Amino acid sequence: QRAYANVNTSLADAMAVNILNVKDARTNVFWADDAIRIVSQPIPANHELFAGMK
Amino acid sequence: MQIKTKGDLVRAALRKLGVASDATLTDVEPQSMQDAVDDLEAMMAEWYQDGKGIITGYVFSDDENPPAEGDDHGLRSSAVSAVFHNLACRIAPDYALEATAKIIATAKYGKELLYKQTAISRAKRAPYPSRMPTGSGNSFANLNEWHYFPGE
Amino acid sequence: MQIKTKGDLVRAALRKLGVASDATLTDVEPQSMQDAVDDLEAMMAEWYQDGKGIITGYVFSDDENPPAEGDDHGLRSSAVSAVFHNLACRIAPDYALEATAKIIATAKYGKELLYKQTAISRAKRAPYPSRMPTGSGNSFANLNEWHYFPGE
Amino acid sequence: MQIKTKGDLVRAALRKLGVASDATLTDVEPQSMQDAVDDLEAMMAEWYQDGKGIITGYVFSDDENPPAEGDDHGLRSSAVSAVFHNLACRIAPDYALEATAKIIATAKYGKELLYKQTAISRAKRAPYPSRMPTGSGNSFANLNEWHYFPGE
Amino acid sequence: MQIKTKGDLVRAALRKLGVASDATLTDVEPQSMQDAVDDLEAMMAEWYQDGKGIITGYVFSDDENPPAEGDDHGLRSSAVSAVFHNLACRIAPDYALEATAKIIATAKYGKELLYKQTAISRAKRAPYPSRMPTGSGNSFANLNEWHYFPGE
């Protein structure tokens, strides 16, 4: 389990959290390409709606 | 109907048992009324197993409303006879008595007739399994790409 | 029929029991007759399961019009014997009684004879299934493109 | 429910037996009350075989809190009748008694209604054996190369 | 539980029988208590066949303690009813009595329930015989030369 650690220390008692968005700003977004995926299916054919629709 | 309250049910049951009826020139002791009402409540909660038993429309008396006697039972007109016959059978042992053969027969018949319509309703058939094709005769389904039944 | 009211039915039942008749020197006090009429109403309501039981033409009394006794029962000429024999059997336990064997046999016969005609009416055959072909020998259906029975 | 404590269960059992009630003239000593509560605890703990017998919600009384009577039994509304009918049957031999046929039949039926839901829940199918193939028709299994069922 | 001693088991058995209770004004006799404790020790020794019979957790008193009564019995909470019902049945003939049908039936049921879990535990299946191969689809076994089952 300790092989998965990503921070040095844990959250301890009076630990102040600091907000990082202190003014309004349009975002710039970077990523590793395989970090966002889109999953897609057709609408199931046995649905309650789409009963008489071709 | 003339049997519209838990007291009416209890008086009918005691009259059937021959404990408290004008044909016997006796009358209901209030303690017996309380005991019979408690027996009716326990029996009705046992029959209606929180929705998975026999459905009759009986309205259980909540704790707050002080006298449980006097409230409408809420039963339909077709359950009253079964309810008070079975109540007479249930409360016969308090007096070291035994409900007679006719009372027992009517209790059985009434309970069966009470559950008849619920049994008819609950005799439902499960849907097709998830591995059953819809066939090519179902042209609409096979054209909308519905080749197998969903299941569940 | 001379028996035209719910109280007439009850009087016939009591006479069959031997408890009270027009010839007896002692009679039942009217609370007993009211209890018997309530028993009759409960029995008839239990029989006629909201239209799905035994059809007799019985007219249930309304609470607004006060006395149930005095209301015509509406039964045909052929149901009176069955109804009051069953009533004698049902209200025998009030008087520490057991209806005799002949009364019980007549009650069974009358109830069965009451349901006979309604059973003959209810014995019906369901239509052809939705997957049943109409047949090419029907001509009209083949030309109208009605090759399969509708169903349901 | 008017029955909300172990003492109330014992009182209902004694009333069913005809030994003591609210209308009675003689009452049992609280030592006998305590003995009957001990019997009820024993019966409940024999039913509930440490979690793998009959599940009821019954709450056991700890020795730290002195009075065993006065603890709410924790039962549902539909189990009270079964519990106190079986309790009456079990405590009848104390008084050189024998519970009557109606109480015995009601005890049987009530215990059975008690265990019905647990039986339904425990009627579960085992998973596939560890040597059974999953089949080529399963898309996710084919994609994951899971060729046999896990098992256990 | 409240029944936490061999003496408590003895008094419960005598209360079931009707020899020494509060429902009957009679009190326990010390000779009867010692004889019942002797019967209980013998009966439990016969049940627990040196570890190969009914396991209950009973603590067999040694000769060191003079009064056998007063010791904790060590039974589980679910064994008390079975133990004292069987004890009452066993010690009935000392007083030329006969245990009632309820006590006999509860004794049978309690003993069967006592052995239920031990029977489930002991329903074990023997390993493969030393003369079967492990098959060739077993990978490891055949690669490390377990061509046959070890057995025993």
Per 3-state DSSP, what percentage of chain D is helix, strand, and coil (rounded to 5)? 50, 0, 50
Q: In chain B, which residue's Cα lies nearest the Cα of A42? A: B145
Distance CA B108, CA C33 (A): 26
**What amino acid occupies position D50?**
D
| Contact state of C93 with B1 under an 8 Å Cβ cutoff | no
Report the b/e string of D65-103 with b at 16+ CB within 10 A.
eeebbebebebebbbbbbbbbbbbbbbbbbbebebbebb
Q: Can you read off the two tokens belonging to residue A28?
A: 């710039």
| Residue among B12, B38, B145, B27 nearest B94 (CA) | B38
- Comparing CA positions, the residue from E11, E40, E6 lying closest to residue E27 is E11
- Rg of chain A over Cα atoms, rounded to whole angstroms, equals 23
Name the CA dihedral angle for D137, D140, D143, D145, rounded to a multiple of 10 degrees.
Answer: -80
Please report, for residues E41, E48, E88, E122, E133, the alpha-carbon distance to residue E53 in angstroms, rounded to integers and kept in the order given: 15, 5, 21, 11, 36
CB count in 10 Å sphere of residue C96: 11
Query: Which residues have a Cβ under 8 Å from the Cβ of A37 and sit 6 or more positions away?
Result: none
DSSP H or E segment with residue B21:
none
Structural contact between residues B61 and B41, judged by C-beta atoms closer than 8 angstroms = yes
Q: How far apart are CA A20 and CA A22, in angstroms?
A: 6
- Six-digit token string for D10: 């014992």
Half-sphere exposure of B47 (CA within 13 A, CB side): 25
Residues from A contacting B (CB-CB < 8 Å) are 42, 44-46, 50, 54
Tokens matching residue C23: 């010839």
* Max CA separation in chain B (angstroms): 80
Dig out the tokens for C146 from the structure. 């009605």
> Cβ atoms within 10 A of the Cβ of E18, count?
20
Q: What length is written for chain C?
A: 152
By residue count, chain A amounts to 54
CA dihedral D37, D43, D48, D54 (to 10 degrees): -110
Q: What's the CA gap between C90 and B106, in Å, rounded? A: 8
Backbone CA torsion sign across D65, D70, D71, D73: positive
| Cα(A42)–Cα(D108) distance, integer angstroms | 55
CB–CB contact D81 B31 (8 Å): no
Instruction: Specify whether the CB–CB gap between B79 and B43 falls below 8 A.
Output: no
**Residue B142 in contact with partner chain A when CB distance is under 8 A:** no
Give chain D positions within 8 Å (CB) of E18. 93-96
Query: Nearest CA to D74 among D88, D60, D90?
Result: D60
Which two tokens mark B45?
């909660």
DSSP state string for B25-74? T----HHHHHHHHHHHHHHHHHHS-TTSS------PPPSSSS--TTS---
Interface-testing mutation among B144, B145, B146, with chain A (most A C-beta atoms within 10 A): B144
- Let me know: does C125 contact B128? Beta carbons within 8 Å: no
- E73 and E4 in contact (C-beta within 8 Å)? yes
- Helix axis angle for C30-47 and C6-17, nearest 10°, is 100
Chain pair A-B, CB pairs under 8 angstroms? 13
Nearest-CA neighbor of E78 among D67, D53, D70, D55?
Answer: D53
In this structure, are residues B95 and B31 in contact, taking their beta carbons and an 8 Å threshold?
no
* Residue B152 · residue B127 · CB < 8 Å: yes
Q: Among candidates C86, B35, D12, which has minimal Cα distance to D20?
A: D12
How far apart CA B95 and CA B104 sit, in angstroms, is: 17
Residue B33 neighbours by CB under 8 Å, 6+ apart: B7, B10, B69
Contact B51, B60 (CB under 8 A): no
Of D2, D17, D113, the CB nearest to B46: D113
Both structure tokens of E62? 């040694």
**CB pair distance less than 8 Å for B49 and D117:** yes
Q: Rounded distance, CA C72 to CA C2, Å?
A: 11
d(CA B49, CA B67): 24
Judged by 3 or more CB pairs under 8 A, whether C touches A is no
Query: Largest Cα–Cα distance of chain A, in whole Å?
Result: 62
For residue B121 the two structure tokens come to 């309703």
Set of chain D residues whose Cβ sits within 8 Å of the Cβ of E100: 93, 98
Instruction: B50-55: list long-range contacts, CB under 8 Å, 24+ apart.
Output: B50/D76, B50/D77, B50/D78, B52/D117, B53/D78, B53/D113, B54/B111, B54/B114, B54/B115, B54/B118, B55/B118
Query: How many angstroms separate the CA atoms of E18 and E99, rounded?
Result: 10
Cα separation of E151 and C15, whole Å?
86
User: 3-state DSSP call for residue E148?
Assistant: strand
Residue pair B103/B88 in contact by the 8 Å Cβ criterion? yes
Direct distance between the N- and C-terminal alpha carbons of chain B, in angstroms, rounded to an integer: 44
Nearest CA-CA distance, residue B79 and chain D, Å: 19
Nearest to C41 among B2, B110, B117 (CB): B2
The residues, ordered by sequence, that sit 6+ positions from B109 with a Cβ below 8 Å of its Cβ are: B82
Mark residue D16 as left, alpha or beta (left: phi above 0; alpha: psi -120 to 50; beta: remaining).
Answer: alpha
State how far the Cα of C119 lies from the Cα of E144, in Å rounded to an integer.
78
- B91: its two tokens: 């409360």
- Resolution (angstroms) equals 3.1
Q: Which residues pair with C72 in a beta bridge?
A: C5
Cα–Cα distance, C21 to C92 (Å, whole number): 15
The residue among D49, D55, D48, D50 whose CA lies nearest residue D122 is: D55
Contact call for residues E48 and E56 (beta carbons, < 8 A): yes
In chain B, which residue's Cα lies nearest the Cα of A52? B140
Instruction: Output the CA angle E102-B42-B109, nearest 5 degrees.
Output: 85
In whole angstroms, give the CA distance from residue D59 to residue D74: 5
Q: Do B141 and A42 touch (CB under 8 A)?
A: no
Compute the distance between CA of residue B130 and CA of residue E35 in angstroms, rounded to an integer.
Answer: 68
**The residue count for chain E:** 152
- Look at D80 and B35 and tell me if their CB atoms are within 8 Å: no
Q: Give the contacts of D29 (CB within 8 A, at least 6 positions apart).
A: E22
Residue type at E46 in one-letter notation:
E
Q: CB–CB of C46 and B103 under 8 A?
A: no
The partner residues of C133 in beta bridges, in order of sequence, read C148
- Please tell me the distance from the alpha carbon of residue B88 to that of residue B106, in angstroms, as a whole number: 11
- Give residues with Cβ within 8 angstroms of C38, minimum separation 6: B1, B2, B3, B12, C68
Provide the number of CB pairs (under 8 Å) joining chain B to chain D: 67
The residues near B90 (Cβ < 8 Å, ≥ 6 apart) are: B39, B40, B43, D102, D106
8 Å CB contact of C98 and B101: yes
Structural Rg of chain D based on CA atoms: 23
Indicate the residue type of C69: E
Place of tokens 């202190």: A22
B150 touches chain A (CB under 8 A): yes
For residue D148, the cross-strand partners are D133
Contacts with D79 (C-beta within 8 Å, 6 or more apart), sequence order: B46, D56, D57, D110, D114
Residue appearing with tokens 């030994």: D19
SS3 state at A50:
coil
Q: What's the rounded Cα separation, in Å, for the pair D47 and D131?
A: 39
Distance CA D61, CA D130 (A): 46
Name the experiment that determined this structure.
cryo-EM
- Residue among B35, B48, B68 minimizing CB distance to D15: B35
Question: CA-to-CA distance for C30 and C52, rounded, in angstroms?
Answer: 33
Q: Report d(CA D107, CA D86) in Å as an integer.
A: 5
